[PDB]
């Protein structure tokens, strides 16, 4: 009883001060490190916001920042869910496509070739 179903776009009610409209979100899956050859940081979406101004503090030596919303990393299972959450918050998003590793047929038999020039020299 009493449903009152209304279809409309999501809006921010519990929102902070004027900083959401200026800052742009970059919902992109984190790339694997150059040295570490393991895929575990990948296959999970991360919504990291663009970094603002940073300067060395006159108090000591640390680099203090005025920008509050900067040091947060969110997790998402689907690309459609991350895009819907960004619209729900209010901030404009620039989504990047996931770069999947291409399947390359790396066979051991190619190392000892006769006709082909793909023969491995000195082991």
């Amino acid at each position: 009883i009493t449903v009152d179903e209304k279809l409309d776009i999501t809006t921010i009610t519990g929102v902070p001060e004027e900083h959401i409209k200026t800052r742009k979100a970059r919902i992109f899956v984190p790339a694997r490190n150059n040295m570490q050859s393991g895929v575990n940081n990948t296959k999970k979406w991360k919504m990291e916001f663009d970094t603002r101004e940073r300067w060395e503090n006159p108090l000591m030596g640390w680099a203090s920042t005025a920008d509050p919303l900067s040091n947060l990393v969110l997790t998402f299972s689907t690309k459609e869910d991350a895009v819907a959450f960004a619209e729900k918050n209010g901030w404009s998003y620039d989504v990047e496509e996931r770069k999947v590793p291409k399947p390359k047929s790396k066979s051991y038999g190619a190392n000892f070739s006769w006709n082909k020039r793909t023969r491995v020299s000195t082991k």
């Binding site: 009493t2 449903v3 009152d4 179903e5 209304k6 409309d8 776009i9 809006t11 009610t13 519990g14 200026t22 603002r52 101004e53």
Partner: protein, 111 residues
């Protein structure tokens, strides 16, 4: 079948009218009983600038949630809790903001 919070579409706007009616009568109570601070006229202008930000009415759920939130942040000063002029001061007076301009913000330091 679906939750409606408090009101459906039209009655939610009348709850805002009910909220504005109650909060307009409470600004003399926040000066004489509480503290003078600024002015009675500027206190009523402080109400208008708060509701002008909420010009984006699109859902009955969003409006009603703001009414329930409004029946706590503005209900705080009716049954007077500990604020003592330091708290319950919505308008920024201590800090001076930089105007939105391509020549003004670039000269000072922004983005």
């Amino acid at each position: 079948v679906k939750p409606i919070f408090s009101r459906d579409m039209n009655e939610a706007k009348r709850r805002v009218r009910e909220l504005y009616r109650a909060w307009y009568r409470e600004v003399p109570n926040t000066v004489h009983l509480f503290q003078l601070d600024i002015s009675v006229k500027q206190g009523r202008d402080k109400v208008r600038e708060m509701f002008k930000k909420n010009a984006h009415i699109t859902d009955p759920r969003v409006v009603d949630l703001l009414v329930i939130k409004g029946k706590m942040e503005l209900e705080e000063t009716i049954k007077v809790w500990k604020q003592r002029t330091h708290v319950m001061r919505f308008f920024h007076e201590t800090e001076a903001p930089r105007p939105k301009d391509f020549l003004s913000k670039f000269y000072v330091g922004h983005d």
